[PDB]
Amino acid sequence: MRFLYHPDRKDISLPGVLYALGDPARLEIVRLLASKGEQCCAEFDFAIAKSTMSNHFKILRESGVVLTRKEGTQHINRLRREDLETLFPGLLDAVLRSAQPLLTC
Amino acid sequence: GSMRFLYHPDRKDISLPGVLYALGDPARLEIVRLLASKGEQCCAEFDFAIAKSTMSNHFKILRESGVVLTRKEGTQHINRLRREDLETLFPGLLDAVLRSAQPL
Ligand SMILES: [Cl-]
Ligand SMILES: [Cl-]
Ligand SMILES: [Cl-]
């Protein structure tokens, strides 16, 4: 599988994770990946410029939140739930409890 | 005994992404961690950057995002965690963040 860049768990920090979630578009991506499982980039039809969405997914990958792979021409994103729960127990649940939907609303 | 606070948003204007962005920095997370365990703290206690303009910007972000109040008292600026606002809006968030925050 063509996995895109992603850090090893050891190089994932709490400030980086909080930073990655610190954006309405990125929070909404994480919220949908958590509830619906893996989703290609094109499912996140935000009213947002192409280069900006690309930077968003780079931020999510560099921070250790999302694992992306190329399948065909799709970029398939996966929430790194197991890594995040191992490092930061209960963090995802506390964030997702309060995250307000955007794309489904 | 001053209740003279710098600009802070109303509870209704605090958003979860804005709060997470404010915590999403080693200096700012440590400020929040210290306010949470030690109580109110003067700005001069937080020597977490080479430049004073960098610390000023950290506190500006903490105040504008709804995490921190800043009180002007004499010559000092005293910071206070907005525990009630944050816990009412984002139940369990502060605990989850603080449980994993590592001392800087
Ligand atoms: Cl795609
Ligand atoms: Cl306001
Ligand atoms: Cl001060």
Asked if residue B67 lies in contact with residue B47, where contact means CB atoms within 8 angstroms, the answer is no
Residue linked to tokens 């929070």: A27
Edge-to-edge strands, sheet with A66-71: A2-3, A66-71, A74-79, A39-40
Distance between CA atoms of B14 and A40, rounded to whole angstroms? 30
Distance between CA atoms of B73 and B40, rounded to whole angstroms? 12
Distance between CA atoms of A74 and B98, rounded to whole angstroms? 37
Q: B35 Cβ partners below 8 Å, 6+ apart?
A: B41, B68, B79, B80, B81
Q: Which two tokens stand for residue A96?
A: 């997702």
Using CA atoms, how far residue B40 sits from A78, B82, B85, B102, in Å, is 40, 11, 16, 20
Residue B65: DSSP 8-state: T
Distance between CA atoms of A19 and B22, rounded to whole angstroms? 8
CA of B26 to the centre of ligand 1 (A): 33
Distance between CA atoms of B47 and B55, rounded to whole angstroms? 8
Among B94, B99, B100, smallest CA distance to B81 is for B94
Distance between CA atoms of B82 and B89, rounded to whole angstroms? 11
- In DSSP notation, A2-44 reads EEPP---GGG--HHHHHHHHSSHHHHHHHHHHHHH--EEGGG-
Distance between CA atoms of B40 and B27, rounded to whole angstroms? 17
Helix (H) / strand (E) containing B90 = none
For residue A38, the ligand closest to its alpha carbon is: 1
**Shortest CA gap A62–chain B (Å):** 14
Helices B93-100 and A91-98 pack at an angle, to 10 degrees, of: 150
Measure the N-to-C terminal CA separation of chain B; round to a whole number of Å: 31
Question: Nearest 5 degrees, angle CA B100-CA B103-CA B104?
Answer: 120
Nominal resolution in Å? 2.0
Asked if residue A87 lies in contact with residue A19, where contact means CB atoms within 8 angstroms, the answer is no
For residue A54, the ligand closest to its alpha carbon is: 1
Q: Residues in chain A, how many?
A: 105
Residues within 8 A of B (CB atoms), A 75-104 only? 87-91, 93-95, 97-100
In chain B, the domains with their CATH numbers are 11-100 (1.10.10.10)
Q: Tell me which amino acid residue B76 is.
A: Q
Compute the half-sphere exposure of residue A81: CA atoms within 13 Å on the CB side of its CA: 14
> What was the elucidation method?
X-ray
Can you list the alpha helix ranges (DSSP code H) found in chain B?
Answer: 16-23, 26-38, 52-64, 83-89, 93-100
Distance between CA atoms of B18 and A89, rounded to whole angstroms? 22
Asked if residue A78 lies in contact with residue A33, where contact means CB atoms within 8 angstroms, the answer is yes
Using CA atoms, how far residue A12 sits from A61, A85, B17, B32, in Å, is 10, 12, 19, 20
Asked if residue B81 lies in contact with residue B36, where contact means CB atoms within 8 angstroms, the answer is yes
The shortest CB-CB distance from B25 to any of A15, A21, A26 is to A15
